[PDB]
Structure formats: structure tokens, C-alpha cells
Design a protein around this ligand. Structure first.
Ligand SMILES: OC[C@H]1O[C@@H](O[C@H]2[C@H](O)[C@@H](O)[C@H](O[C@H]3[C@H](O)[C@@H](O)[C@H](O[C@H]4[C@H](O)[C@@H](O)[C@H](O)O[C@@H]4CO)O[C@@H]3CO)O[C@@H]2CO)[C@H](O)[C@@H](O)[C@@H]1O
Length: 409
């Protein structure tokens, strides 16, 4: 028989077991094929995938962050070109842009799932504070005014910080600035994807508006030293009135109720990100699946990728991971009438914006994580009083290095 190996990032509570439950229909129908998943944590995934593409010590298949697909596909001989091998008509068209290398008609990944970051809020905090979450989060200015009412609000003894967000030590550092830059009227690169432009007046206005929510005491500053995992868990413990998070947190908050009696899940709602002066824009992320060119079982691997794109496999993986399907027909399933999931779907569809799918973007994210986190060091005044001018200089320095990276293509 054929033993297909696959790498997956931690997309659900028990990643390997949950993947195996989703692929069981495939292996039942193909008893001569087995699937063996291996988990690779997000922090190491880019290094391990890059090394596997070069060395040939690689699985047949790997999950790849959507923002990294062009980086891997652009490596000569790294991935199987999938152009014309997958029926793209079943996919939500917008999810295909990250599967192609910008500037080419070459498809090197298959969209697997998508995700966006939405605004979670505590319903009990909002009522006690006189905040109507149906209208008071709709714009930047109403949002900031709501945070002032929410900051220091007491909810059953606990004093809550208005907004809680991470600041360091993972890939989300740039993701969490993204829609603030877009909403201000900026972008990270030019239309060609060849020149960094996030030091523009508009991009800086978004960076300034967001970072100075913390300077004004509305965003919890101790949390800016932490990563996404820490802040997701803190919100689940009732530490903040609001937070921007992906849909996967619904899984952990649900488990917290079922296992520990924590009913935070029943006290929260979700709404779209507030509208900025450019209009509403949201982060569009997700993951693709790729076949390594060193695979000795490419026919079987392609069969597995096609199964992962089937309606039922898309629905079942969404139920366990809370990620959004990339296949249109999956949204016909009754599961998608869930009020929370509908917000993420509506947001990504109407307003989701994905980074340019250029080969240098993966390298830029490494620079972003190190560089933009220094904005929070400025805000936290670990080395002198906050200065907007320091933030500007940080952004310009990061932009200069991003430019050198882009010019390697
Ligand atoms: O930039 C690269 C890439 O990023 C993608 O976005 C990723 C984030 O980078 C990543 O931090 C995030 O990780 C989630 C994970 O999906 C959840 O499953 C996980 O849930 C935990 C839970 O907190 C624990 O309580 C429990 O024990 O286990 C599970 C899993 O271990 O929580 C983390 C966040 O802390 O996932 C994002 C989406 O994949 C972008 O989508 C992509 O576009 C980028 O290319």
C-alpha cells in the first residue's frame, strides 16, 4: 500500500486525532492508502518547511500558511505545480490568490481553510458600561469612545481592561496591525508587490491610532509583552471587555465550559472590526496544502488534496477547528447558521484583504515580528517616554530592510 505523510500546524485542540477523524472516509474508501499526520508548531513551521523543500527530508504533503505559499513555491523544484490539476471552480475565488505566485499564472498550493480576526466583546461588561455593541463598535471613533466607557469597568468584582491584545513573539504581530493600516488608507507594498509602502502617511495614521490606544490607557499594557496564546487564554478568564481574535478561540472557550464550568462562552458576542476612514477592511489569512516535489506518491497525494477540498471534508474540519471553509458548497450545511461563524464569514467575504503573494513575504514576516514589536516597547516606555517619532523611525527602518528583501526577486 501507499503511506502518505503530512505535516499540519496546530489547527485544533488535538490536531493529529482531529485530522484523522476527518480523513477516515477517505481511507475507508481507499484501503490501500494510509495517512500519517505530524504536527509542526507555528513558530518552527517556516524553517522546517523551507529546510524540507531543500533537503528532500520531507513529507508528501504539508500545510502552509497562506502568506508563505509563494515563498515555498518560488523555490526551484520545491513543490508540485498544481495548475490545471485541481478544479478551481468549487472554491471561493478570493481564497485562490494566495495559492498563486503574484506575477505568474502558476498555482503551487490548494486552499484548505481561511480565517479572519473579529472583535469579541463581553455582553455583561457592555451593559454595565452603557455600551450598545450593535452600534458602538461600528467605526474607529465610536470604538475608541466605547473603550473609554469600558476601561476599568467592574463585572462581578473583577475590574476589566477595555481591550486586550498581544504584542510579541509570534506571526500575529503584523497580522494585528494589518487592518488598522488598511482602514487608515495604507498598504504594505505597491500594486506590483515589489516595494514596501507602509511608511506612508496613511499607514502611519493607522499604526498611530492603534498603538496609542495603549498610550491612552485603553489597551492593557502588561498584555503587550505576551503572545496570542496568552491573551486568548486571558480573555477566556474574563480579563478584558474586548479583544480581536480568530474563530478558533470558540473551541477552547467551549471546552472551558464543558470541562471547568467556565461560562465565559455564554457571555460574549462577536462583531466585525470597526470601520476606518478608508472603509472597512479585515485581515484575510488561512492555510493551503502543498505536495512536495520529492514525493514518491504524487498521484495518491493529489487524490488526498482533492478529498480535503470535498464538501463533507470541508464541513467536518470546520466544525472541529472553527476555521472557515474555502469551498463554496460547504456553506450550504446547517452548521453555518451559527451566529458567531456567520460574522467571520461575512467579514472575510465582504472585507477580507490578503497580503501580496510574493516570494519575499515569508522573510518579511520574520522582520515584521521582530521590528514592529519595538513599537510596543516604545509604548510601554521600557527605554524612555513614549514618542510617536520613535515609532516613525522604527517603521522606516523596518521598511528599508523589507525593501532589500523584496529586491532579491
Ligand atoms: O503568518 C503565518 C500564518 O499565520 C496564520 O495565522 C495563524 C497564527 O499564526 C497562529 O498563531 C494561530 O495559532 C492558533 C491555532 O490555530 C489554534 O488552534 C490554537 O488553539 C490552541 C488553544 O489555544 C489551546 O488551548 C489548545 O490546547 O490547543 C490549540 C492548538 O494548539 O491557538 C493558536 C493561537 O494561540 O493560528 C492562525 C491561523 O492558522 C495565518 O492564517 C496565515 O495566513 C499566515 O500565513
Amino acid at each position: 500500500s501507499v503511506k502518505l505523510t503530512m505535516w499540519i500546524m496546530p489547527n485544533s485542540d488535538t490536531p493529529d486525532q482531529d485530522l484523522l477523524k476527518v480523513v477516515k472516509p477517505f481511507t475507508d474508501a481507499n484501503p490501500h492508502i494510509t495517512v500519517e499526520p505530524t504536527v509542526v508548531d507555528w513558530s518552527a513551521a517556516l524553517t522546517k518547511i523551507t529546510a524540507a523543500a531543500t533537503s528532500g527530508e520531507a513529507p508528501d504533503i504539508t500545510q502552509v500558511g497562506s502568506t508563505w505559499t509563494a515563498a515555498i513555491g518560488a523555490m526551484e523544484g520545491a513543490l508540485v505545480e498544481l495548475t490545471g490539476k485541481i478544479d478551481t471552480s468549487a472554491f471561493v475565488e478570493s481564497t485562490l490568490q494566495s495559492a498563486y505566485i503574484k506575477g505568474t499564472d502558476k498555482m503551487f498550493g490548494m486552499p484548505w481553510f481561511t480565517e479572519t480576526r473579529a472583535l469579541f466583546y463581553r455582553k455583561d461588561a457592555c451593559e454595565k458600561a452603557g455600551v450598545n455593541p450593535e452600534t458602538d463598535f461600528a467605526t474607529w471613533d465610536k470604538f475608541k469612545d466605547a473603550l473609554k466607557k469600558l476601561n476599568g469597568i467592574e463585572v462581578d468584582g473583577k475590574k476589566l481592561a477595555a481591550l486586550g491584545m498581544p504584542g510579541k513573539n509570534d506571526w500575529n504581530v503584523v497580522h494585528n496591525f494589518s487592518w488598522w493600516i488598511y482602514g487608515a488608507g495604507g498598504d504594505f507594498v505597491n500594486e506590483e508587490g515589489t516595494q514596501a509602502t507602509f511608511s506612508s502617511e496613511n499607514a502611519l495614521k493607522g499604526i498611530k491610532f492603534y498603538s496609542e490606544l495603549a498610550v491612552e490607557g485603553l489597551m492593557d499594557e502588561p498584555s503587550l509583552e505576551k503572545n496570542t496564546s496568552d491573551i486568548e487564554s486571558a480573555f477566556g478568564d474574563g480579563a478584558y471587555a474586548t479583544a480581536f481574535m480568530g474563530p478558533w478561540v470558540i473551541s477552547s472557550y467551549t471546552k472551558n465550559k464543558e470541562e471547568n464550568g467556565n461560562d465565559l462562552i455564554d457571555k460574549i458576542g462577536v462583531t466585525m472590526v470597526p470601520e476606518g476612514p478608508a472603509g472597512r477592511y479585515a485581515f484575510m489569512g488561512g492555510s493551503n496544502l502543498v505536495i512536495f516535489n520529492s514525493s514518491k506518491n504524487k498521484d495518491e497525494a493529489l487524490e488526498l488534496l482533492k478529498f480535503f477540498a470535498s464538501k463533507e471534508a470541508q464541513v467536518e474540519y470546520s466544525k472541529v477547528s472553527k476555521m472557515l471553509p474555502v469551498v463554496k458548497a460547504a456553506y450550504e450545511d446547517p452548521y453555518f447558521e451559527d451566529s458567531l461563524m456567520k460574522v467571520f464569514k461575512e467579514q472575510v467575504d465582504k472585507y477580507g484583504k490578503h497580503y501580496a503573494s510574493v516570494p519575499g513575504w515569508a522573510s518579511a514576516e520574520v522582520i515584521f515580528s521582530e521590528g514592529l514589536s519595538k513599537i510596543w516597547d516604545n509604548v510601554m516606555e521600557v527605554d524612555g517616554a513614549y514618542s510617536y517619532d520613535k515609532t516613525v523611525q522604527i517603521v522606516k527602518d523596518v521598511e528599508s530592510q523589507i525593501n532589500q528583501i523584496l529586491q532579491e526577486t
